[PDB]
A paper describes a structure:
GORK is a shaker-like potassium channel in plants that contains ankyrin (ANK) repeats. GORK, also known as guard cell outward rectifying K+ channel, is the only outward-rectifying potassium channel in guard cells. Each protomer has an N-terminal transmembrane domain (TMD, residues 58–313, containing helices S1–S6), followed by three cytoplasmic domains: the C-linker (residues 314–365), cyclic nucleotide-binding domain homolog (CNBDH) (residues 366–510), and ANK (residues 511–724).
Tetrameric reconstructions of AtGORK were obtained in two conformational states at resolutions of 3.4 Å (AtGORKFL1) and 4.3 Å (AtGORKFL2), allowing de novo modeling of 662 of 820 amino acids (residues 58–720) for each protomer, while the remaining regions were not resolved due to their intrinsic flexibility. The full-length AtGORKFL forms a tetramer with elongated cytoplasmic regulatory domains, with its architecture showing a symmetry reduction from four-fold (C4) to two-fold (C2). Remarkably, ANK repeats from two neighboring protomers form a stable dimer through specific interactions mediated by their protruding loops, creating a buried area of ~1,500 Å2. As a result of ANK dimerization, positional deviations and conformational changes are induced in the adjacent CNBDH and C-linker, leading to a reduction in symmetry within the tetrameric channel. This reduction affects the communication and coupling between cytoplasmic domains and transmembrane helices, ultimately maintaining GORK in an autoinhibited, preactivation state. Due to the reduced symmetry within the tetramer, the C-linkers exhibits distinct conformations between adjacent protomers, either “flat” or “kinked”. Analysis using the HOLE suggests that the AtGORK adopts a closed conformation.
Numbering used by the authors:
A (entry chain A): 58 to 397
B (entry chain B): 313 to 481
C (entry chain D): 228 to 312
């Protein structure tokens, strides 16, 4: 098959949607749910079969060679390449990790294994790589968007883990956790395992989001000795993430803009013109002409001028000859004379 | 940043300019190829190289370029010491298919040796100029008689294929 | 009006003042209290005396602080670029 087939791309988009769903659901299944309920039977099953089908179909896809511009179509070699990099993790993540938990005596580590399914975020990573290659979207805005998605995914995962850390403590000694000690307004979280899923999730995500923005109100804070060590790591990592975001936005802005260039040009012009003490009507004429010059995209000529190396020939040939032969002084002249 | 950013920035500006005026896909291509080349390390490579006194470079030249200059028939002087004198002062240069190298106007300045690739040799005439003078290939010379006897480089040459042409003062 | 507790205002006890009936206070006290909250949250200070307490306020605060984080990064970037030039 060809890395750019009509529907293969349709399958890629389908699997991207499924990958987003699984990436955003696995931490929530692991944290807020000590064993998936009965109602959520078919959702897990369908997700697993979909990703297994993708595995099988990826086993039948030609790969583009890296050092060399040949896309190979050797089935044994596509086998080898797939079975090396991204087969073991995708296969292990495909096993039913809820039925195994509810069959193997309900042991905790088989549920801890659920985090293998986070490897599907590679799909979004490759999607952002493809978007970066495309010429429609600027490179640096793509980098900013990728960092904004990374921040939000890390925040959601951190919220799931932060609620999980409050379930390790025994239910009787629940007064010594970040949740179960809240008294927000009139509401008190007494038995925090008996509230709706969305209340607990929104509280945890509220804590994580006002922590990633470095607001930190302090209505919800860490209490245990395991919740302190988690917040230290989370804020230490968030600091560097935020510095990266600021740096990328700064680079995007510092690249430049047309109004900035025009204002610099007019700065030089006004300095030179006030220095030589020329007349005001000349000032108006010059500023009007330069304003038209920068409105007409005059600076494209020099940009093209910087080492195109004579492929200008057909550019000018297709761009200017429309107005050339028409003038009543070239009638009956030679073609190469017109081109030159 | 890095060079992968300069490439993308220049190509983005070029795309803006080209699609703003609806140029056409064939030239789009010509341009793309050219842009790509300038960015690639081939160029800034030799330029930066510079500095390295020469003694040291000397060995770089005699390890890279020696067989290439030895395989040209014109240099059968049989003195490999003369040939090592030749290699010690060579500078590479890459031109894309469709690049003017030398024409009648420019006098001799360098010995343009031709590496793997085809460069078209032509001359001029008085009605459509002239076509098909000679198709230079590897292990040959190009622009030699001018330094040999007298200045001025006739046989206008516009390259037709990619080639890693050498150049000696 | 019955559940004026369990609200960001109505459960406030700044100093010795209690926002008991938060619909009869002067318009300017309510307005400048809300603005105070919004400004210490856009400056990323977040004192914590005025905080979201419901589930319709947690969502709004999350959206607002995400948007303001991006905006503050943008303002820092503009000032840095103009100083660098
Ligand atoms: K703060």
């Amino acid at each position: 098959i060809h890395p750019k087939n009509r529907w293969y791309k349709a399958w890629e988009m389908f699997i991207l949607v499924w990958a987003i769903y699984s990436s955003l659901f696995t931490p929530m299944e692991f944290g807020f749910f000590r064993g998936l309920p009965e109602r959520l039977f078919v959702l897990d099953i369908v997700g697993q079969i979909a990703f297994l089908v993708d595995i099988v179909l990826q086993f039948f896809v030609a790969y583009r060679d890296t050092q060399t511009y040949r896309t190979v179509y050797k089935p044994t070699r596509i086998a080898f390449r797939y079975l090396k990099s991204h087969f073991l993790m995708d296969f292990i993540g495909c096993f039913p990790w809820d039925l195994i938990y509810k069959a193997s005596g309900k042991h905790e580590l088989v549920r801890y294994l659920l985090w293998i399914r986070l490897f599907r975020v590679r799909k979004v990573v490759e999607f952002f790589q493809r978007l970066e290659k495309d010429t429609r979207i600027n490179y640096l805005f793509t980098r900013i968007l990728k960092l904004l998605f990374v921040e939000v995914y890390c925040t959601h995962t951190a919220a799931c883990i932060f609620y999980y850390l409050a379930t390790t403590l025994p239910p009787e000694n629940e007064g010594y956790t970040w949740i179960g000690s809240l008294k927000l307004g009139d509401y008190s979280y007494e038995n925090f395992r008996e509230i709706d899923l969305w209340k607990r999730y929104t509280t945890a995500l509220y804590f994580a989001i006002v922590t990633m923005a470095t607001v930190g109100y302090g209505d919800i804070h860490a209490v245990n000795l395991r919740e302190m060590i988690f917040v230290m790591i989370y804020v230490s990592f968030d600091m560097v993430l935020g510095a990266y975001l600021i740096g990328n936005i700064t680079a995007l802005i510092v690249k430049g803009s047309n109004t900035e260039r025009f204002r610099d040009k007019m700065n030089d012009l006004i300095s030179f013109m006030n220095r030589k003490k020329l007349g005001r009507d000349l000032r108006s004429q010059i500023t009007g002409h330069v304003r038209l010059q920068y409105d007409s995209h005059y600076t494209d000529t020099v940009m093209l001028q910087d080492i195109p190396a004579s492929i200008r020939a057909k550019i000018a040939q297709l761009l200017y000859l429309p107005y050339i032969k028409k003038v009543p002084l070239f009638k009956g002249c030679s073609t190469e004379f017109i081109n030159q | 940043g890095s060079n992968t950013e300069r490439f993308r920035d220049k190509m983005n500006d070029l795309i803006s300019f080209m699609n703003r005026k609806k140029l056409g896909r064939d030239l789009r291509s010509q341009i793309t190829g050219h842009v790509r080349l300038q960015y690639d390390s081939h160029y800034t490579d030799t330029v930066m190289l510079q500095d390295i006194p020469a003694s040291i470079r000397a060995k770089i030249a005699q390890l890279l370029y020696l067989p290439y200059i030895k395989k040209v028939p014109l240099f059968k002087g049989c003195s490999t010491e003369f040939i090592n004198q030749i290699v010690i002062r060579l500078h590479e240069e890459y031109f894309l298919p469709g690049e003017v190298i030398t024409e009648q106007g420019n006098v001799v300045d360098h010995l343009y040796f031709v590496c793997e690739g085809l460069l078209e040799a032509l001359v001029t005439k008085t009605d459509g100029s002239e076509e098909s003078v000679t198709l230079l290939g590897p292990h040959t010379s190009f622009g030699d008689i001018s330094i040999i006897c007298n200045i001025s480089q006739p046989f206008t040459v516009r390259v037709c294929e990619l080639c890693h042409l050498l150049r000696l003062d």
